Amino acid sequence: ASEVRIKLLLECTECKRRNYATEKNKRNTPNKLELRKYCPWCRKHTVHREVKI
């Protein structure tokens, strides 16, 4: 973790609840992360989007 390597939350794009915390390098990966993850509310896999922490 640094200024370039930031922490972030992953928000389930269906129910908007933040289910995961992780990191990326915003110089190497400037665009928002989209990753399919299991959402424990929706009880299914969902695209989660990077949201600010």
Partner 1 sequence: PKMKTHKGAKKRVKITASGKVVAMKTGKRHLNWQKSGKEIRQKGRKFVLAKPEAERIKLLLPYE
Task: Give me the residues that bind partner 1 (CB under 8 A), please.
Answer: 1, 7, 21-23, 53
38 binds Zn ion (CB under 5 A): no
| Contact (CB, 8 A) for 8 and 33 | yes
13, 25, 32, 49: which one contacts RNA (CB under 7 A)? 25
| HSE of 49, CA atoms in CB hemisphere, 13 A | 8
> 15, 21, 9, 8: which is closest to 40 by C-alpha?
15
40 binds RNA (CB under 7 A): yes
DSSP 28: T
Instruction: Enumerate binding residues for RNA (CB under 7 A).
Output: 1-2, 4-5, 7, 9, 16-25, 28-29, 33, 35-38, 40, 43-45, 53
